Each structure stands twice: as structure tokens, then as C-alpha cells.
Amino acid sequence: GMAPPSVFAEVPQAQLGVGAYRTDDCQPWVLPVVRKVEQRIANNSSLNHEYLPILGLAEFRTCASRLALGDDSPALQEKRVGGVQSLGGTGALRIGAEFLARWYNGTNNKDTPVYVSSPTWENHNGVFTTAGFKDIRSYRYWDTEKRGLDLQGFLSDLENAPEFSIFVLHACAHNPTGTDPTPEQWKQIASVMKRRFLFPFFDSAYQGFASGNLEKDAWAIRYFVSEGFELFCAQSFSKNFGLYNERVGNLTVVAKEPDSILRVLSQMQKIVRVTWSNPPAQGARIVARTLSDPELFHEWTGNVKTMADRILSMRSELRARLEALKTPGTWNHITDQIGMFSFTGLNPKQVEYLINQKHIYLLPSGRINMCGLTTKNLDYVATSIHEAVTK
Amino acid sequence: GMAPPSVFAEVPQAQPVLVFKLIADFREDPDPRKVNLGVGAYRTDDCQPWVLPVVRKVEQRIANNSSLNHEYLPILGLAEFRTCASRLALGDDSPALQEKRVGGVQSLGGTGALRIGAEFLARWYNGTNNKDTPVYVSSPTWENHNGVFTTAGFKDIRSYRYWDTEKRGLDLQGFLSDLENAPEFSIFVLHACAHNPTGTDPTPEQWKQIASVMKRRFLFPFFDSAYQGFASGNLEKDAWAIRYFVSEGFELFCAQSFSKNFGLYNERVGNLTVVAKEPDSILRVLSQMQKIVRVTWSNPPAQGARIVARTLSDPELFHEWTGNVKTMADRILSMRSELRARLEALKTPGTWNHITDQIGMFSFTGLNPKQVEYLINQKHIYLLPSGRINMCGLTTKNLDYVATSIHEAVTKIQ
């Protein structure tokens, strides 16, 4: 019998692996300072739920930017810094990408190349593609054979990039390889970028998380600022505050003069208004309170160090069991790598042994999260790995 | 010597939105009689923001559960929230829920639900990447409808007749004519109830006429539902038009906001409800929704959704919330009734029953822009040049002043 066809009839179906921090117990961890501030918030009868400003909670935006840039930053003294509270680091990247696609290098120029690292966090392509960018390029970064950063490959890709190209840079704790340039390598990178007018779009999702120290982990950003770059920095508080599901992020903008900031933020407002309208309050409030209070801030830093040290511990104990197991290959990359994630150096095959032969679950890329290791399994994975590297 | 120019040197300063200018001025006003009818959120009789008692109760509960963690929610949101929200709009006994052809996507308020649904439509509706499909919005409408559909890529945004300045009412004939003349598969953004900004809604009988032309011409209903319960005090009646379309066999989208009816403005709690002809299409549609969310906000925040989900799934808290909701609706009905009564006592020229025929916190008063200027400049009564007022700016204490002032504006300025 007759009947109308659905307007969705032809919609097609879209087509150690843990991605967050876990204790040695293998549980999620609400940071102690976060639990403390949540209690304070719940018992402050004087807070309401009225809409935040479109650009977000003022105190959060100021605090977030100062964290990346440092209290003593020249750009903050000179008032040429702005911040846009966003929906996690993803939202910050998306808002920045939408801005650049409309107002950077010409008006509505979707032709500017965008360079991402090879490999990189996968949603990078997705966000910039969705903002309209036609030409997404990757730069050389991971040296599979030396199992480390291909500096010559990266610098060459920088040299051959058209002027005004946008580079997405990981501030620290590169995702997914765990391999970061040293400060001296950063200086060489900055060098080419300044010469060819390349725009730095920093992605900062692990500040503090990666080395245990917030100051250290923000150095590259601050270095670019001190060298007089204009730049965007997408900040996530998902990991270093453990507030994954409250979607707390900040887009920091650094300009050459204070006037530009006002105009840039005015256009930002328009883009936010038609995306989420204004941002949610709960996570931002927790971050702002923590960062504004010297004693909470001090506690927080201790909590972040705790996470960072546990990862360093699985890192030094893993390379060591591996080494001491006289397992074939160099493994100083496992300790030289920084952050939650490590590119093991295994091949897809080896990984097959891992998931199929001894039930170790990790990506085809060879990526593991160090937070899935415990004192209770460290031993076991170490031989399954010495295992695979061998059969 | 020379320092090369900012890459931002040519970015223009955007132009501001009037309402912000209006709020500013209001605060910069020293006259103790000043009145803000331009506010955009609920206010009590002593002009304060109101946190719902059930929300404060649930927040405490949440603070005191140690079992809760902050791990990422699924991309499409908290499952219990998505179900409860969709059931609230459609009703527990909805044929669509029983037949499993309903889907829910947690969103960043009603704005985010509209944005995600617009993005979907611009990629997969009426062909592939078809951005030419006309999108129709009411005349006038909530200022952000245009921007959201424009940014999703739609190029042909049109208006349907709606508000009739002469009748101070619904132009049903013009609406019906614009429906009749719309190209097949055009998308219509419809206000479920409490039309923003006019407060004028079709009656049930009128909705039936609207639905019959959309059915015939395969016009797509994209409902915007920001005031369920808040509107009438009655959750069922306020969902009537949505449910009627479902019962008539329509496929549709429904952008739900919990900002107003839960007073959770700043926790950005929204839901996109999807109703399809077949169960299997919901799976495919949500798979595409996931990809769109992924590159926008990645996954949604937890706090507001946890609050709504707990309230709606617990009989004692649900009953309490319906009482809080009724309180808000009742204050608004009372200001409407009190204002019209005063205008009529003063023998104010013209008809004023639109004041009580309208629904929700917003009202198109019919005042002209010259009468609006008078109220701001001479009376310290702040409202938009359209004549839009928020009924919540009215209180038992300023009512006489406002009625009297409008009466002055109407009689001395023609």
C-alpha cells in the first residue's frame, strides 16, 4: 500500500586505550581540591543561575589566560590579551578556527593552509575542516625509526609552508606521541615561523599535567609571546583539573596592540552566540575559585604533581622492566616521552600479539595510555611486550 | 624602524545589540521610579532572580553523593537525561516512543539544539549538502533563529506572516498563505507555545489548519520549545501542538530548552528530540549527529543535565517541580491580568485584551516607537522599540506607575 517515504530514508550510517587519568587502583580520580570547592559552591546560597556573559565568566577568563602566560607576562601588562571561555579545549579550537576562516588573511579566506602534526589528535582535522578550511596539511613530526621527533623534517615543512599558513602546535605533552621539542628546538621552530609569518595556533590541553610543573609546561607559549608573536592558545581544563564532563576551556588571544583585542572579541561574541549562546557556569566557577585563592591553588598544584609523578613512575618502571628483560630495541623514548600518552614503537602486527595473544588492548598506532598501567600489571604487560617484540 | 602590522589590523568592531545598551542605561538611571521591562529572564515580585527550590534541593543532593565522577559523558549526552527530556515533550503514552522511533541529543541549551539540528539538515536533508532549501521563520521571531540557520549554511531565509499590528494578533490568513506558497520540503521553525517575542500563539483549531497545509506540501516542522510548563503552568497543554503533529504522522525535530522552566539559564541544558517514521532511521540519524557534536563541543556538560534527569525521574521531586513551575506561570498570569485591568480602568484608548490573550513572559503591547521613546525618556520605563515587554518586570508595587505611564503615552502621543 502507498505511503510517504521518510525524509531520513537515505541518511547513511556514520562509520591501555583509556583516554583519561586513572589511579593505581584503576579508578577515575576527582581531585581533592575540586571536591572541596564543589562543596563550597553547593552551600553558597547567594549564587544564582542567570546567564553568563556571552564571552564567559570574567574571573575565569582572566585566571585562565594568566595561567598560560604567567603573572609577569608583558602582554598582560600591556593589555593585549583576551580570553573566550569555551566548551572544553574542543570548543576553544572550534571558535578560533571559525574566527580565522572569517577574518584572517583576507575576509572569508578558506584557502589558507592549516598544518597539523603527523600524527596528531584526530579531532584537529575535523574541527578545522568543519570551520570551512579546504587545505589541511600535515607537518613531519614523529620519526618512526628513531622513535623521536623528526626535527629536520618539521623545519623543512615549515620552510616550504606558504606565508601566513596556520600551524596547530601542541604546547607540551604531544598527543598522541608524548614527544615534545626541547626549548632549543622550539627556538629553531619559532625562528622559521617568525620569518615566514606563520601563525601559531597552540593547543594546550596538558599544562602542568605533563611534567608536574605548570610553569615549565607553559614555557613554549611564553617564549613565542616574548618573541612578539600574535597567537591563539586553546586551553583545556579537562585533564589538569579532571573536569572532563563540565567542558571547561579557554581561548587565549594575544595581539600586537590592545585595540585589536576589543575588535577580535566583538567578532568572537557573534560566533559564540550562534553556537552555544553563552557558556555553562559550574566548571568555570570551580576553576576560577581554585586559581584565585592562594591556598586552593597550592593544593591544586600538589594534586597535579601527584598525577604527573604517578605517570613518571609507570614510565621509569616500564622502560626498566623492558630494558632489564633484555627486550630488543632502545626504550629511552618511553622515559623521554612526556605526558599520559606514549607511542610504543610497536608495529600493527606486534599489537596483534598484544590484543589477540595476551589481551593487551591498545590502538593500531601503538599508542598506550600510561595511566592504564598499575603496580599490579606493570610486570605482566612488560613481558607481554617483551613477548611481542620477539615473536 | 617599522613594526609590521597586526594580522588583526583590519578586523572590524562588531555593532552592538540594542538590548545591552538598554540594560546599561537602565542601571545608569538614578530615578527611583525606573522600571526594567527589557529583562530576558524570570524575576520575582521583588525583582530578583529565582533559583527553583527543587533545583537547590537537587544540587545539594548532587554535592553530597561521592559516587559521582567527572569522566566524559557519551557524545550524545547523559542517557537518562535524553530519555526523560524526550518523554516530557512527547508524553509517556506517545505512539512514537512506544514504536521506538524517537531519538534525543543532549545540547547546549535550546540554542545548541537548534544549531545541531540546522547542521544536520544542511548536510543530509532534501538531498546532500543542500543549502538551498528555504527555511521559514515567524515575523517577528527570536533574534537568534536567523543567525543559527545562516551559520549552518542556509542561504535562503524567509519569513511567514505572524504578528498583525492592526489586529494586535495572529495573522492566520497570511500565515496560511505563506504556507500554501512554500516550496515542498521547506523547513518551518515553529514556536511550540509562548511565542517569543509576541506571546501570541495559534489556538488548537488554528494549529490544525497549519498542520494540514504542512502535511500536504511536505513542509518540515522544526519546533522550538523553550517554555514548556512555564507557559501555562500545565506541561501537557503546553506540549499540545508538538504531540498533535506526532499523532498526525509527521516526522519532526524539537529543540528543547530547560533554561526557563528549570531556571538553569547558565548551565546550558538543551535536548534535540527527533521523531522519524521508522525506528531504523533513528540509529543512522544519531550516528550523523555524533559527528557534528564531536567537532563542535565534543561532548556535553553534566551538571545541569544531572539535575533535570534526577528531577524528572523521581516522583516526589517531579511533583515539587511542577509546583515551582506553576508558581512562575501564575505570577505571570497575574501581572497580565492586573495590567489589563488597570489600563481599562484608566479608559485607555484601544483594545487591551491581547494583554491577557497572550501567553508567557513576553508581550507585544502594540505601543509604537514614539510611545516607546516617551516611556524611556520621560518615564524611566525601559522596553524595546518593538513594544516588547517582559511581564516579569512588573510587580505589585510598580503596576500603578506602569499602567498610568502607558496610558499617558497612548493618549498624548498619537
Author numbering:
A (entry chain B): -1 to 13, 35 to 410
B (entry chain A): -1 to 412
Describing publication, verbatim:
Here we report the neutron crystal structure of a PLP-dependent enzyme, aspartate aminotransferase (AAT), a fold-type I PLP-dependent enzyme that reversibly converts l-aspartate and α-ketoglutarate to oxaloacetate and l-glutamate via a ping−pong bi−bi mechanism. Pyridoxal 5′-phosphate (PLP), the biologically active cofactor derived from pyridoxine, is one of the most ubiquitous cofactors found in nature, catalyzing ~140 different types of biochemical transformations. Recombinant porcine cytosolic AAT fortuitously packs as a biological and crystallographic homodimer, with the two active sites having different activities toward the substrate analog α-methylaspartic acid. In AAT, the protonated pyridine nitrogen of the PLP (N1-PLP) enhances charge delocalization through resonance, permitting the subsequent transamination reaction.
To probe the structural changes that occur upon internal aldimine SB protonation, we obtained a low-pH X-ray structure of AAT in the absence of substrate, in which both chains are in the internal aldimine state. At pH 4.0, the internal aldimine shows geometric differences near the SB of PLP compared to the neutron structure at pH 7.5. When the geometries of the internal aldimines (chain B) from the pH 7.5 and pH 4.0 structures were compared, two major differences were evident. The torsion angle between the SB C = N bond and the pyridinium ring, and the O…O distance between the Y225 hydroxyl and O3′ of PLP are different. In the pH 4.0 structure, the SB is 22° above the pyridinium ring plane, compared to 46° in the internal aldimine at pH 7.5. Additionally, in the pH 4.0 structure the O…O distance between the Y225 hydroxyl and O3′ of PLP is 2.9 Å, compared with 2.6 Å in the internal aldimine state at pH 7.5. In the other monomer of the pH 4.0 structure (chain A, with restricted motion), the corresponding torsion angle and the (Y225)O…O(O3′) distance are 26° and 3.0 Å, respectively. Protonation of the SB nitrogen of the internal aldimine at low pH appears to introduce an H bond between O3′ and the SB by reducing the torsion angle between SB and the pyridinium ring. However, protonation of O3′ cannot be ruled out as H atoms were not observed in the low pH X-ray structure. Forced protonation alters the PLP alignment, suggesting that the microenvironment involving Y225 and the phenolic oxygen (O3′) of PLP influence the SB protonation and reactivity.
